[PDB]
């Protein structure tokens, strides 16, 4: 009845020497990486980027998530500290304690019945779709635009930087920040252009994920085209994936491998070349994201 969690994603805890350069680790990695569709990277334990965001002027209307919506086939502004007392709030009054004591399966298995729900409307907030360039990235980046202390260089220029990745494919982009909280949530897809990602969370309560190997793409494609609603059967992937939420159990019940983890603050997430991926927040958090060529 209840929510069965998916087997964990590999995680990997790179020493000094394999943490030289993310692309020869990832690389290194992709044989059993590239099987799961996502993995979790733990720095070394002194590898701490200082937060270099712009937090006296950081604003941002969050768009609005009602957990139910397909089921059910039915904007302030905030700064970054409004919107965590906003979200510490909602998840200690939901859940009747304080927020870092409720379990993360505990999160998850009330997220789940929520999107299924049809006698309960949860409706929450996700600071989704920010770019680095509003605010400043949540690295620090010789930019000239925020002073950088001498102890942060070695992070401006490290290759695991966001900002630092290549970018560019070879033929004939910058980070984006995601504010959440309890709750908030993005739907099964792919990167455009089936791109690798890679994902920071830079402080705050973890990010559950969900991932499935690039191998098992085109099953969960037609487990999806099956369940999905008969209204939005017919439409294109880039407008589908808009509403492609759906509970890791049902696509694991058709043979689908589903992977997850939790993502805590100062770890990384890489998604493989597509691999479709879903997940929604723990509680307050801040993480980066940007898409990477190899
Ligand atoms: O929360 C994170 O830490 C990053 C999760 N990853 C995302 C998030 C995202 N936001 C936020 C969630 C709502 N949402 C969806 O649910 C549909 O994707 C769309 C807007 N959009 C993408 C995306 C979109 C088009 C092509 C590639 N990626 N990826
Ligand atoms: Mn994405």
């Given at each position: 009845?209840?929510?069965?969690?998916?087997?964990?994603?590999?995680?990997?805890?790179?020493?000094?020497?394999?943490?030289?350069?993310?692309?020869?680790?990832?690389?290194?990695?992709?044989?059993?990486?590239?099987?799961?569709?996502?993995?979790?990277?733990?720095?070394?334990?002194?590898?701490?980027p200082?937060?270099?965001?712009?937090?006296?002027?950081?604003?941002?209307?969050p768009?609005?998530?009602?957990?139910?919506?397909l089921?059910?086939?039915?904007?302030?502004?905030?700064?970054?500290?409004?919107?965590?007392?906003?979200?510490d709030?909602?998840?200690?009054?939901?859940?009747?304690?304080?927020?870092?004591?409720?379990?993360?399966?505990?999160?998850?298995?009330?997220?789940?019945?929520?999107?299924?729900?049809?006698?309960?409307?949860?409706?929450?907030?996700?600071?989704?779709?920010?770019?680095?360039?509003?605010?400043?990235?949540?690295?620090?980046?010789?930019?000239?635009?925020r002073?950088?202390?001498?102890?942060?260089?070695?992070?401006?220029?490290?290759?695991?930087?966001?900002?630092?990745?290549?970018?560019?494919?070879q033929?004939?982009?910058?980070?984006?920040?995601?504010?959440?909280?309890?709750?908030?949530?993005?739907?099964?897809?792919?990167?455009?252009?089936?791109?690798?990602?890679?994902?920071?969370?830079?402080?705050?309560?973890?990010?559950?994920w969900?991932?499935?190997?690039?191998?098992?793409?085109?099953?969960?494609?037609?487990?999806?085209?099956?369940?999905?609603?008969?209204?939005?059967?017919?439409?294109?992937?880039?407008?589908?994936?808009?509403?492609?939420?759906?509970?890791?159990?049902?696509?694991?019940?058709?043979?689908?491998?589903?992977?997850?983890?939790?993502?805590?603050?100062?770890?990384?997430?890489?998604?493989?070349?597509?691999?479709?991926?879903?997940?929604?927040?723990?509680?307050?958090?801040?993480a980066?994201?940007?898409?990477f060529?190899?």
């Amino acid at each position: 009845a209840e929510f069965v969690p998916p087997p964990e994603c590999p995680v990997f805890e790179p020493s000094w020497e394999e943490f030289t350069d993310p692309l020869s680790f990832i690389g290194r990695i992709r044989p059993l990486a590239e099987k799961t569709g996502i993995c979790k990277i733990r720095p070394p334990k002194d590898w701490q980027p200082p937060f270099a965001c712009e937090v006296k002027s950081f604003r941002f209307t969050p768009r609005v998530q009602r957990l139910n919506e397909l089921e059910a086939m039915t904007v302030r502004e905030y700064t970054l500290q409004s919107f965590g007392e906003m979200a510490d709030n909602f998840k200690s009054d939901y859940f009747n304690m304080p927020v870092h004591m409720v379990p993360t399966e505990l999160v998850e298995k009330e997220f789940w019945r929520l999107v299924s729900s049809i006698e309960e409307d949860v409706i929450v907030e996700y600071g989704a779709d920010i770019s680095s360039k509003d605010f400043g990235s949540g690295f620090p980046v010789k930019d000239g635009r925020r002073k950088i202390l001498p102890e942060e260089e070695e992070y401006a220029l490290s290759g695991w930087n966001l900002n630092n990745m290549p970018v560019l494919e070879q033929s004939v982009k910058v980070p984006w920040l995601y504010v959440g909280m309890c709750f908030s949530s993005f739907c099964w897809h792919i990167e455009d252009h089936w791109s690798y990602s890679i994902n920071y969370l830079h402080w705050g309560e973890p990010k559950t994920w969900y991932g499935v190997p690039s191998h098992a793409a085109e099953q969960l494609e037609e487990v999806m085209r099956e369940l999905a609603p008969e209204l939005f059967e017919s439409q294109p992937d880039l407008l589908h994936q808009l509403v492609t939420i759906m509970n890791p159990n049902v696509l694991m019940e058709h043979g689908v491998p589903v992977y997850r983890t939790n993502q805590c603050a100062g770890e990384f997430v890489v998604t493989f070349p597509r691999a479709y991926h879903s997940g929604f927040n723990q509680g307050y958090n801040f993480a980066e994201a940007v898409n990477f060529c190899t």
